[PDB]
Design a protein around this ligand. Structure first.
Ligand SMILES: CN1C[C@@H]2[C@H](C1)[C@@H]2CN(Cc1ccc(F)c(Cl)c1)C(=O)c1cn(C)cn1
Length: 552
């Protein structure tokens, strides 16, 4: 009742868009599009969005909107797969631990960019080496190809270590930046005025303005003409191979943030009679448009750098933090007034990270609150938020150590790759195959006011589970040990990452022991029949909305 509602649908749309658009749309998508064929890769991309992304997004949004309960509540349909919700928390923990750290790094790149002359531009500093031949050097990759930005990142932002067990003194600037980031998130998420409602306006709109300013500065007369023909070229003969289709499906699934407790949490707070069908296609379209726009803004300046360096664009191209912190800044430093575009870029990165961390902390907080929901624990939601924030800050300290980025990449690659796919597959199977497709269809028709579109039904029953199984199989078949620029992680890392992935994957089958022998456990067929039929509680979480068929 007093859980609160959005009050304005624009608020929900903006918060959801801010969560959907993450840092992946900045570095992961442009390089993937460049590497995976060429400008034709959009055809495997958007088609997947039509058949994989939008249906799953609609499923999650309708699930949350009708359930009117958090990450754990939505699973009151079958009180056996509730552990899936538990898993949806655990992954939401891991990302929430290693997302802020990235923000932390970006935060350290924000204040350091307020100086008159950029610190990662000139090789006259005392942390340089003999291999600092940079472009702005007026006064062994191939021969000495170590740009000053990479040197600054490797030697001053965090002193990289050789092994993984080498843990030196913690990086004090990174500790301070992580503390500032966590404090900002908590102070915004106080719910004293709103559940980050009227503060998600700026954090969800300003990144678009910054991207627009960057685009106008990057498509002016700079020589960045052969910087878009390498991103908008018709390499049609690279759509036959299954690898590009698998990568497109993976990007569609991971970029949209499906099935880790993000969409469900803020879909729960929605009013019941909300056109969630309109509220899913719109957000998916904005996410894809943002990815496309980022594919232009970065690559324009990358082509400018390629022209100024006398090399082709393929020489300068990175997939993750390499593009964010050492490739893009080394190109931004060459503009006539650099520490304004650099400031805008880092501010936009901070805003994009916050747009997702807000939702992650909301998901964890609302799950914890709704699990033990009484008139006591709803009165002190802010205290729970403070406790979870301090726990996240304390747990994230080792990731700002000398070997922080190794563990960051390990957690990114392992802890939230298999578990997401498995969780989504299990939820998709259970929702319309264990509970029933027709019951869910009439349930959706109850809330939307119209039957679901004739295409979404056949996409839910057939196309979406098949695509999820396909991406699972492609992930299983395509696997290589996680490696840095040049480093092979020993067992101390691969085994640990496997254990972290299992700590979320196995969370589902471990719930099967909570169904004790009291629930008619013997005669296994009867026990399976029970503990999965919806109880007297599942349904709309309000009165005057029973509509006869629910609780006469
Ligand atoms: C594999 N991952 C897991 C997970 C995906 C891809 C989510 C995190 N990532 C990228 C990322 C964050 C920090 C990193 F250090 C690196 Cl390497 C990558 C997002 O972009 C994102 C997506 N949504 C919906 C919100 N954020």
């Amino acid at each position: 009742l007093k859980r609160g509602n959005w009050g304005n649908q624009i608020e929900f749309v903006l918060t959801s868009v801010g969560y959907a658009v993450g840092l992946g749309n900045v570095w992961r998508f442009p390089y993937l599009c460049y590497r995976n064929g060429g400008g034709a890769f959009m055809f495997p991309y958007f088609i997947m969005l039509i058949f994989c992304g939008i249906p799953l997004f609609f499923m999650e949004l309708s699930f949350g909107q009708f359930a009117s309960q958090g990450c754990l509540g939505v699973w009151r349909i079958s009180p056996m797969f509730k552990g899936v919700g538990y898993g949806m928390m655990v992954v939401s923990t891991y990302i929430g631990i290693y997302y802020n750290v990235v923000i932390c790094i970006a935060f350290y790149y924000f204040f350091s960019s307020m100086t008159h002359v950029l610190p990662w531009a000139y090789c006259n500093n005392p942390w340089n080496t003999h291999d600092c031949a940079g472009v702005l050097d007026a006064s062994n990759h191939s021969l000495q190809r170590t740009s000053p930005s990479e040197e600054y990142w490797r030697l001053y932002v965090l002193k990289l270590s050789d092994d993984i067990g080498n843990f030196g003194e913690v990086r004090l600037p990174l500790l301070g930046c992580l503390g500032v980031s966590w404090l900002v998130v908590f102070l915004c998420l106080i719910r004293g005025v709103k559940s980050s409602g009227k503060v998600v306006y700026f954090t969800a709109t300003f990144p678009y303005v910054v991207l627009t300013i960057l685009f106008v500065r990057g498509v002016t007369l700079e020589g960045a003409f052969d910087g878009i023909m390498y991103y908008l070229t018709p390499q049609w003969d690279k759509i036959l191979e299954a690898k590009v289709w698998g990568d497109a499906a993976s990007q569609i699934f991971y970029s949209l943030g499906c099935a880790w407790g993000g969409l469900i949490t803020m879909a729960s707070y929605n009013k019941f009679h909300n056109n969630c069908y309109r509220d899913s296609v719109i957000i998916s379209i904005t996410n894809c448009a943002t990815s496309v726009y980022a594919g232009f803004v970065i690559f324009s300046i990358l082509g400018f750098m390629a022209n100024h360096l006398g090399v082709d664009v393929s020489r300068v191209a990175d997939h993750g933090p390499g593009l964010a912190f050492v490739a893009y800044p080394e190109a931004l430093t060459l503009l006539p007034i650099s520490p304004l575009w650099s400031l805008l870029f880092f501010f936009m990165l901070i805003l994009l990270g916050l747009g997702t961390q807000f939702c992650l902390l909301e998901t964890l907080v609302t799950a914890i609150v709704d699990e033990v929901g009484n008139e006591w624990i709803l009165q002190k939601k802010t205290y729970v938020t403070l406790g979870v924030a301090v726990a996240g800050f304390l747990l994230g300290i080792p990731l700002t150590s000398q070997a922080g980025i190794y563990w960051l990449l390990l957690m990114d690659n392992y802890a939230a790759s298999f578990s997401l796919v498995v969780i989504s597959c299990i939820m998709c199977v259970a929702i319309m195959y264990i509970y029933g497709h027709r019951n869910y269809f009439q349930d959706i028709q109850m809330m939307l006011g119209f039957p679901p579109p004739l295409f979404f039904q056949i996409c839910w029953r057939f196309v979406s589970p098949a695509i999820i199984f396909f991406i699972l199989v492609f992930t299983v078949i395509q696997y290589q040990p996680i490696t840095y620029n040049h480093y092979q992680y020993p067992g101390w890392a691969v085994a640990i990452g496997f254990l972290m992935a299992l700590s979320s994957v196995l969370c589902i089958p471990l719930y099967a022991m909570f169904r004790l022998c009291r629930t008619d456990g013997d005669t296994l067929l009867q026990r399976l029949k029970n503990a999965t039929k919806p109880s007297r509680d599942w349904g709309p979480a309000l009165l005057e909305h029973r509509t006869g068929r629910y609780a006469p």
